[PDB]
Curated annotation (Swiss-Prot):
Part of the whole protein covered: 82 to 368 of 368
Glycosylation sites: N212
Reactions the enzyme catalyzes: a beta-D-galactosyl-(1->4)-N-acetyl-beta-D-glucosaminyl derivative + UDP-alpha-D-galactose = an alpha-D-galactosyl-(1->3)-beta-D-galactosyl-(1->4)-N-acetyl-beta-D-glucosaminyl derivative + UDP + H(+)
Active site: E236 (nucleophile)
Lineage of producing organism: Eukaryota, Metazoa, Chordata, Craniata, Vertebrata
EC number: 2.4.1.87
Protein name: N-acetyllactosaminide alpha-1,3-galactosyltransferase
GO molecular function: glycosyltransferase activity; metal ion binding; N-acetyllactosaminide 3-alpha-galactosyltransferase activity
Chain's gene name: GGTA1
Length: 287
């Protein structure tokens, strides 16, 4: 029964892109009415899920800070379930959770290459959606562990299929985007095509939609393997091809996933999540 104008006012942010050509909102600080949405979703009694992977020394470096910050800032006022996937449960940090948060932990196999640890998430998330997440939540987010929540990340972000604008590229022209440009890859996007450059560090939707996102990306990853090719930015290259073909029903501004190495320019008004500094010499164990 919700209507876009019930909660979204693009004229509050006149100097940034707030609407796509296919009429999806781009959610910027100032445009959303969270009170209206919190009342609407509470009456439906929703639950929201969040998947996060930590394999190898990503556990010690990032998992505690990710979960402590998610407890404080993610969908406050609604029931949330954190789904944590790790290769060694004995190293999992067991922090205290607050009202309306709970969790569960799964042991997964560690792939040999960091590139395959990142890409295999697509397979694993779909398996979990079919086995249990579809029965447990109304909406799901799937996130990288190497980042920290900084302020409220709330129900204004919910939708059928949700994409994140990558912080370094949101003002750029598509022919400058780092899409996969080799026609032999399933992830190929030709010059002359593309809407935005999306970040694979945050994506979400209903369980049905996220199942389709992850299944289609993993099919592409598998096809490339049979053709002896590996996409330039791995699962992110495939996710950008997916969202070109199947346009997202909502996009989040870079305020929702910001890199402070850029600085803090005028367009970024209140940061909800920030990147961790890269530490590849320690946390990765192959080139
Ligand atoms: C303008 C520019 O070159 N900026 C780069 C960033 O793109 C880069 O971030 C990485 O970007 C890729 C896709 O290109 C991917 O999203 C990675 O996850 C992300 O880390 C950044 C790295 O520090 O350097 C900038 O100079
Ligand atoms: O050795 C690995 C490599 C990847 N990841 C997971 O996959 C995500 C994607 O990798 P990464 O964040 O290193 O990619 P980047 O954002 O730096 O391109 C990480 O945040 C983790 O959740 C991990 O757990 N261990
Ligand atoms: Mn990351």
């Amino acid at each position: 029964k919700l209507k876009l104008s019930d909660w979204f006012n693009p004229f509050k942010r006149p100097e940034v892109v707030t609407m796509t050509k296919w009429k999806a909102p781009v959610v910027w600080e100032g445009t959303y009415n969270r009170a209206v949405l919190d009342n609407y979703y509470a009456k439906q009694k929703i639950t929201v899920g969040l998947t996060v992977f930590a394999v190898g020394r990503y556990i010690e470096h990032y998992l505690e800070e990710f979960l402590t910050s998610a407890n404080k800032h993610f969908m406050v006022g609604h029931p949330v379930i954190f789904y944590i996937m790790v290769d060694d449960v004995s190293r999992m940090p067991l922090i205290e959770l607050g009202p309306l948060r709970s969790f569960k932990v799964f042991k997964i196999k560690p792939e040999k290459r960091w590139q395959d640890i990142s890409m295999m998430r697509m397979k694993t998330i779909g398996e979990h959606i079919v086995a249990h997440i579809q029965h447990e939540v109304d909406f799901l987010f799937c996130m990288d562990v190497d980042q920290v929540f900084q302020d409220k990340f709330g129900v204004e972000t919910l939708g059928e299929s949700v994409a994140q604008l990558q912080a370094w590229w949101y003002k750029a022209d598509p022919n400058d985007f780092t899409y996969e440009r080799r026609k032999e890859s399933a992830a190929y996007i030709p010059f002359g095509e593309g809407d935005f450059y999306y970040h694979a560090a945050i994506f979400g939707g209903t369980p049905t939609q996220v199942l389709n996102i992850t299944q289609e990306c993993f099919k592409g990853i598998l096809k490339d393997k049979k053709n002896d090719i590996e996409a330039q930015w791995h699962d992110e290259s495939h996710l950008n091809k997916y969202f070109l073909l199947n346009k997202p029903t909502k996009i989040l501004s870079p305020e929702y996933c910001w890199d402070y190495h850029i600085g803090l320019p005028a367009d970024i008004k209140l940061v909800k999540m920030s990147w961790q500094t890269k530490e590849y010499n320690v946390v990765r164990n192959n080139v």
